[PDB]
Design the sequence.
């Protein structure tokens, strides 16, 4: 069942890349232009949006995708250069991909949670005391967040299955 | 008629992909900017738009297209990996494509219906009690929705015809 | 004269595709942003624009182009599948392309006419009784409409010439 | 000197295509948004802009470029179809290119003149009597218009030289 | 040092093309939208911007790049036509490239100077007498202008070195 | 360990290029539109933004990437020209790339520091005395700046390792 595992992993990676590159940019285009705070203080919108969304979801997902693909690029470069042994490099890159995927999943959970609330309570300068701000299309962003989390979890499960197939004794050496 | 069925299925899939990728993004570009609610409450436009359109039609159709194409990608990857038995994989991927197409059709019907009304009655916080909001180019979006439903139905019919051609006794094994 | 007819048909199809894909999107970009109605009623602009232009000319032309190209795609896919009788398929696709072109020409005439008036009289809710709206760059859109109609007419004439060359006794059989 | 003439003609055609496709779209992007009329009448801006610029320069130049390239496409398609006499087709396409280029140059002169005035005097409904409107970046558009006229004139001269090289008694037959 | 000279010239040309195509468009995107004049007179912003920046730097640089590359295109086309003596054409195109680069450098100096002031004093109709206008991101544009001047100067020096290597007694013949 | 060093250097360079080209443009899109100063003075926003961000981070990073890749382009062009000794050119380009990377890292540190403050105190004409301005999404820009600094540091370390592998006595000769 290793071959089906590799096929599924490749398919899921391509699926995630396509979904991000196609829709993520459009979904988060007006994230700040349509972010409005109930206030008259100049600069409160900027500060409140920055506090609410320190890093946009799309940027985080793009960075995650590139980082997770990086070990594959390392392996491909090594293979290309070798021609004008590789099993150890393959095992190492599998381990690194596992670690990177797990770390990115955990970071996404700890940074964004599982939903984007429609209201934000912002109490940052220059806003006077505490103000209420309203997010743009929170439901679509929540769906995107949950779907990306599910896809990353599937990738993590497939990578863990591949690692188990490789076996502990074989990564120890 | 299996060959003409496959030809028609491929043609319809390419047609749907082209139509989406070419016009869908432009049609739904100003969905939120031109969405206006008869109110003075800050943040009511965002909440009302989010309630009216939890997921944009274009995003749902893009996701549907990628998901429906996924089994073909799995089959192609399996074929590539095999070279440096496949009939069972072909039957399985045909079944999965049929199921995915039917599911996406049903989901589209249950999520969007058959028309996009020009008026929306929004009663979500912070809007005071009940307010009236006005949708951008509802007729074009209704035409797009109906056309996509028809194309998906044609795809479902072709997939069912292919499944019937394969026969129950072959998919059972 | 069949060969020159085919060459002219191909050239005209390519020319129409190029013109649309290059200038239509830019011409019809600010169709709604620059559409203004003389009124204070919120949501009257959206309703009046939707009534005036149920389907943008550019979307209709893109759909027409893809649909009229569809029979050629069907023929190409059939030819590819055959290699690892075709005259009948060629005749059938010629007939279908002729019918599609004629239908799209008639639909364009019945749906848009021959000009885009600079003034529109809109009496749709929520607009109070009757209001006057002003279209964006009506002259350029009128020129585009007339030019597209002329190109479609040339395509129809070429298709009819090809059909006449083929002969009724051969389409019947 | 026919070889150098053909080389110069090809280079000039490519140069014009590159210049248009690279800068023309950006130069005319804000043609309507930055067009302002000294009035309070709703819809007067749209009418005055439409009267001042019935067809954008960029659209006209794109149409001209495609049309002048069309005879070359016809020749290439004829050559492709011939393989699985051509001198007459070459002469005919050269004559047609000459006629098209001359006609487009004359049309540009009669439609746009040689400069884009910074002020426009607009007396079209709904504008109250006569109003003054101000064009966006008129100097850049004037420079672009003059440069395009010069390039088209160079193309016309080269095509006329090629025709003279071919000779009257040879086009006649 | 003719080989290293040619390599450096090619690298510098590619570098300039890349820098322009990548950043120049973005740098000058909001040149007019962010250009503001201290006045209430309608149309004063357009007139003052047109006077301050008759031709955008990016358009001038694009035109310069294409024109400077034109002799190379002529040489390549001549070489292609020759196959189904060239030293003279090479010398001629070297001379023409040198002349074009020098002319464009001189024109840039005489047209834009070496800096973009943050304030512009505009006294063109309809502005009343004399008004003050404020330029968008003048420092970035000044840096871009100086950098482009330096790159063009390097290109001019390399071309002059190549010409000196060729020798006057060889260009004369 | 030279081999893993080269592979890592190539992978990191590709990673930086991808990250910039994919997200940097979008992160810094509304840098000036969302820049707001607490004042009524016309033209104060432009001056304050220009003072706060003389050169956008994205432009600096693009310039750095192209300049750092330039030595590789020189080496490739030299290799191509030689075919229809190279070790010295390889060593020279390695030294130049190391120097360029170090210089760009130092320049980035001196020009931008390590964070983008959310508040800016601007006292440039025409702003009256001293005004407060609010930056757009400062946290995301700070994260991007720190990440780019880390990547550049990794590149510098790898280049220094390669230089040490080559040794002093080889670069000296």
Sequence:
């Amino acid at each position: 069942s290793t071959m089906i595992g590799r096929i599924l992993l490749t398919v899921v990676v391509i699926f995630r890349i396509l979904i991000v590159a196609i829709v993520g940019e459009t979904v988060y285009d007006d994230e700040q232009t349509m972010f409005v705070c109930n206030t008259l203080q100049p600069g409160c919108n900027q500060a409140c949006y920055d506090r609410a969304f320190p890093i946009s979801h799309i940027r985080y997902w793009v960075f995650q995708i590139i980082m997770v693909c990086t070990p594959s690029l390392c392996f491909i470069t090594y293979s290309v250069h070798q021609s004008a042994g590789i099993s150890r490099f393959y095992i190492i890159q599998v381990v690194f991909r596992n670690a990177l995927e797990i770390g990115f999943l955990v970071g996404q959970y700890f940074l964004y949670g599982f939903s984007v609330p429609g209201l934000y309570e912002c109490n940052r300068y220059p806003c006077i005391k505490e103000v209420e701000c309203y997010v743009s299309r929170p439901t679509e962003k929540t769906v995107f967040l949950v779907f990306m989390f599910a896809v990353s979890g599937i990738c993590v499960v497939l990578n863990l299955a591949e690692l188990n197939h490789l076996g502990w004794r074989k990564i120890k050496l």
Observations:
- The CA atoms of residues 8 and 158 of chain A lie 8 Å apart.
